[PDB]
C-alpha cells in the first residue's frame, strides 16, 4: 500500500493495491505424435531447381 | 564433381611403415576439414584423426603412436604415413570431407561425401 499511493504513512481506509494470480504450478506441451522428420534434404540438396 | 580417390594399398610386412594417399579433385583443402576412418572386417568403422585447413592435427589417442597425417597443398592431397603396422592393423581405409557447414541428414559419421577406401593386409606373406 505505501508502495502503491508512493508515501511512507497511509490514512485510514481501503485501498486497492493489486490483483492476486494464482500463479502457474506446471507446464504443459501438446504437439501431435508425428515422429518422422520432415524431408528438407530432398528440397535443399537436389539436384536441379 | 566432388570425388575422392586414395591409392596405396596392399602387402605390407609387420613391422614396416606404410605411407597412403589421398588425392582429392572437385575440391581443394584451403577451407575443409578432412578425416581418415578405417574399417575392420569384423567391427564397424573406427575414426582415425582429422587435418585441419589451418594445419591442425588431431588424433585417436589409441592410435596416435603410429599414424601420421600431412598434406602437399600445391597437389591438394592428403597423406597418412602409417608405421608399424600389426595384425589388426589390417583395414580399409576411408579418406572423408566433414560437413562442418551443414547437416541436411542426422549423419552418424558427420561426413557428406566418402572416399572408395584402400585395403590394407598386414600377415606373413
Ligand atoms: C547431397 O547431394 C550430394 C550430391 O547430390 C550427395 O553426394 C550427398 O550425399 C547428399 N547429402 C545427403 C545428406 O543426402
Known amino acids: 500500500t505505501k508502495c502503491t499511493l508512493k508515501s511512507f504513512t497511509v490514512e485510514k481506509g481501503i485501498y486497492q493495491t493489486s490483483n492476486f494470480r494464482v500463479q502457474p504450478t506446471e507446464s504443459i506441451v501438446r504437439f501431435p505424435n508425428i515422429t518422422n522428420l520432415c524431408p528438407f534434404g530432398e528440397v535443399f540438396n537436389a539436384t536441379r531447381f | 564433381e566432388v570425388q575422392l580417390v586414395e591409392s596405396g594399398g596392399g602387402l605390407v610386412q609387420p613391422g614396416g611403415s606404410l605411407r597412403l594417399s589421398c588425392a582429392a579433385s572437385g575440391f581443394t583443402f584451403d577451407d575443409y576439414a578432412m578425416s581418415w576412418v578405417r574399417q575392420a572386417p569384423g567391427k564397424g568403422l573406427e575414426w582415425i584423426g582429422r587435418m585441419y585447413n589451418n594445419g591442425r592435427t588431431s588424433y585417436n589417442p589409441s592410435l596416435k603412436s603410429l599414424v601420421t597425417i600431412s598434406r602437399d597443398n600445391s597437389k591438394n592431397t592428403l597423406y597418412l604415413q602409417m608405421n608399424s603396422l600389426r595384425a589388426e592393423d589390417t583395414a580399409t581405409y576411408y579418406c572423408?570431407?566433414?560437413?562442418?557447414?551443414?547437416?541436411?541428414?542426422?549423419?552418424?559419421?558427420?561426413?557428406?561425401?566418402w572416399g572408395q577406401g584402400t585395403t590394407v593386409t598386414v600377415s606373413s606373406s
Open positions: 572423408a570431407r566433414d560437413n562442418l557447414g551443414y547437416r541436411p541428414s542426422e549423419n552418424l559419421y558427420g561426413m557428406d561425401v
